[PDB]
Design a protein around this ligand. Structure first.
Ligand SMILES: Nc1ncnc2c1ncn2[C@@H]1O[C@H](COP(=O)(O)OP(=O)(O)OP(=O)(O)O)[C@@H](O)[C@H]1O
Ligand SMILES: Nc1ncnc2c1ncn2[C@@H]1O[C@H](COP(=O)(O)OP(=O)(O)OP(=O)(O)O)[C@@H](O)[C@H]1O
Ligand SMILES: Nc1ncnc2c1ncn2[C@@H]1O[C@H](COP(=O)(O)OP(=O)(O)OP(=O)(O)O)[C@@H](O)[C@H]1O
Lengths: 535, 83, 83
């Protein structure tokens, strides 16, 4: 009797974007159980009896496990859902574990080489397979169970009709001894799909629904696939479900009571509008970008009041192009510096947005109020680790000076964060990927003295307003003072020089605007004069 | 109103122009924060020689704000607290 | 053997049976009575955690340390498996 079911077919499986992993798993697990036993005996080998999987949440682990379990024409697979074998009475946990393998042992001793096949699923293997303490005083809560499992999987007796599978999210906590090639040999990683993977996933989760004419011709599947970038597997299904629900909700109503129409429900259709709506406000990707942060950092937009803003943007674009289409330098960093209130964070955010990378994350101290240095180091480590799971990335560090906890008195600061950032600004990403880091600051000399400028590859300068003409141009662009007052103000500022940042100009304008209609110009001039220059 | 009754122990007496000047500059900031849209956050710092009566004027300005939420954070409710 | 045999006076969390087990094994392996047809073999990954009283001469004398082979060993290992 063949191991595989007579009618099994790959297309019925319903899996997309994991062809290579499935092929390798098949090759390493089942290839030896397909040809007649004579050749297998001649080669004198033993079948593998272990598998493992891991990855980030929502990638299709349980689905693959269940599919592989169903793919075999044998007994019904057992199941264990995390700590479901623990017990309070002494020694019962080990007896429970042993009970699982009794059937396989009996089968082997009875029928020998023609025995059947059995499967098991230690789902959440991490729950009861933590590393042994290996030290007196650190007795583990679950140690006898681990020892019993290790003994049974490969002990004084041999078995060749078993197969174990595991799934977890922390592959670095499993006991070391349980990962040698004799017990758990084949282990694979499940990652985020690619464009073709997303297309396949959307196609599989739509084929059926197209059977009964439930799709208008306005749905361009290729456009929908290309639009959604770096989406986990589950989120595509979530989007489709939400779109279907919102499309169906229009025919139904309720409010005071509940009722349903019967003359319109037979012409149900789903169009691209509902899809768009939901895509916008329904599913919030986890490894992507959203306009909320940009709206929070670009609150007042960007205005081209002179030449430097264009040069800065061009330099940013050049750096982005270099990192994107280069291979000898997979790590380039740029440091933005300038006087206070010069408006430097907004330019960084604009560059990051316009870069058009799949993944963008902003690490700012706003979310770390009152933390201890250990928490800050952990957060930075987590963010940088997360940034290592994409073919293109970009990270922005905001207000470095406030991150180091600097204070001129003493001076004082936190050394651990500085050491972590210094080590973390030279760690090349995993081979075959790219990265880009953009920083900001308001005190260049301090960093130059702490021996930090040898870690950054370049540097840009963001100046202030330098001449009355640029101030007048900015005022006109904002559109607050009209021509009549513009002439009077210009007649004054034109014959001198100014030194102010745009943010301070906005605040000054706002403060001035609160006075009487015909007293605004005088107070504005007085405030501008009192501001001073202080070169 | 208990907090205001506590931090203002003897009311306010106008002994000269500076009191009027301060109370008139406070309302300007209040109106700016209430009517503006390009600046949702505004801050002001009061300073003067010791024993000049700053807290009283601050409390009076806050009360005259007429805002629907006024909480005063003082250092006398955390005696013995750690950082 | 490490699972059952540990240093006496450590695992005291409702230890209904563990120290009694180890004491009984100590007594049985070599007590007032003597035998001449018993042979005890033990495999462990943590040599330094076993009880010293079980390491005395007459109970467990032979102690061998299995290590990684060398080039010659690798040669023999790969020759045996492919014959
Ligand atoms: N390639 C895929 N094609 C279709 N559906 C997929 C795919 N990958 C994952 N899924 C979806 O995964 C869902 C089941 O959740 P899943 O088992 O993937 O979560 P998980 O990764 O196991 O999460 P956890 O981290 O908690 O273990 C199903 O709805 C299934 O449609
Ligand atoms: N053309 C422009 N260039 C720069 N900033 C602009 C421009 N137009 C408007 N702005 C405003 O300038 C503000 C400057 O940003 P932000 O408030 O972070 O100040 P900053 O001076 O960069 O920071 P810091 O106070 O840390 O020195 C941005 O919020 C943006 O709204
Ligand atoms: N017009 C006034 N302006 C200010 N304070 C006044 C006025 N009239 C009376 N006072 C009294 O001033 C006192 C000031 O008390 P408070 O402890 O707040 O002083 P302070 O000088 O602001 O504080 P500190 O002692 O911390 O320097 C109030 O108790 C109030 O009784």
């Amino acid at each position: 009797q063949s191991i595989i079911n007579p009618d099994w077919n790959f297309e019925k499986m319903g899996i997309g974007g994991l062809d290579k992993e499935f092929s390798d798993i098949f090759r390493r697990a089942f290839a030896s159980r397909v040809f007649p036993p004579e050749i297998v005996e001649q080669m004198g080998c033993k079948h593998v009896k272990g598998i493992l999987l891991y990855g980030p949440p929502g990638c299709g682990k349980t689905l693959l496990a269940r599919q592989i379990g169903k793919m075999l024409n044998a007994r019904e697979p057992k199941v264990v859902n995390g700590p479901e074998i623990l017990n309070k009475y002494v020694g019962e946990s080990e007896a429970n574990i042993r009970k699982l393998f009794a059937d396989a042992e009996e089968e082997q001793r009875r029928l020998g080489a023609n025995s059947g096949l059995h499967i098991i699923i230690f789902d959440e293997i991490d729950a009861i397979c933590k590393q042994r303490g290996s030290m007196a005083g650190s007795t583990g809560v679950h140690d006898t169970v681990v020892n019993q499992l290790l003994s049974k999987i490969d002990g004084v007796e041999q078995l060749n009709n078993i197969l174990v599978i595991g799934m977890t999210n922390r592959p670095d906590l499993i006991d070391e001894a349980l990962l040698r090639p004799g017990r758990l040999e084949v282990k694979m990683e499940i990652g985020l799909p690619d464009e073709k993977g997303r297309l396949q996933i959307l196609h599989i989760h739509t084929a059926r629904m197209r059977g009964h004419q439930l799709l208008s011709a306005d749905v361009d599947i290729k456009e929908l696939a290309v639009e959604t970038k770096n989406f986990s597997g589950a989120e595509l299904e979530g989007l489709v479900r939400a779109a279907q629900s919102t499309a169906m909700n229009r025919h139904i109503k309720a409010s005071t009571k509940v009722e349903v129409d019967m003359e319109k429900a037979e012409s149900l259709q789903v169009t691209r509008g509902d899809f768009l709506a939901s895509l916008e406000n329904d599913i919030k990707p986890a490894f992507g970008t959203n306009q909320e942060d940009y709206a929070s950092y670009i609150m007042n937009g960007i205005i081209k009041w002179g030449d430097p803003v264009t040069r800065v943007l061009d330099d940013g674009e050049l750096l982005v192009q270099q990192t994107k289409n280069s291979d000898r330098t997979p790590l380039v960093s740029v440091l933005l510096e300038g006087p206070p209130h010069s408006g430097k964070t907004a330019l960084a955010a604009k560059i990051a947005e316009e870069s058009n990378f799949p993944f963008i994350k902003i690490c700012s101290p706003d979310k770390m109020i009152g933390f201890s240095e250990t928490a800050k180091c952990q957060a930075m480590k987590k963010i940088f680790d997360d940034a290592y799971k994409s073919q293109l990335s970009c990270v922005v560090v905001d207000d470095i000076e406030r991150l180091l906890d600097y204070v001129p008195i003493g001076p004082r600061f936190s050394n651990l964060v500085l050491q972590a950032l210094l080590v973390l600004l030279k760690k090349a990403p995993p081979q075959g990927r790219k990265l880009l880091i953009i920083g900001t600051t308001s005190r260049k000399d301090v960093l130059q003295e702490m021996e930090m400028l040898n870690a950054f590859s370049t540097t840009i300068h963001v100046p202030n307003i330098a001449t009355g003409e640029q101030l007048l141009e900015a005022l006109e662009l904002l559109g607050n003072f009209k021509d009549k007052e513009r002439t009077t103000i210009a007649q004054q500022v034109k014959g001198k020089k100014v030194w102010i940042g745009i943010k301070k100009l906005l605040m000054l304008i706002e403060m001035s605007l609160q006075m009487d209609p015909e007293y605004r110009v005088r107070k504005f001039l007085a405030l501008l004069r009192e501001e001073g220059a202080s070169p």
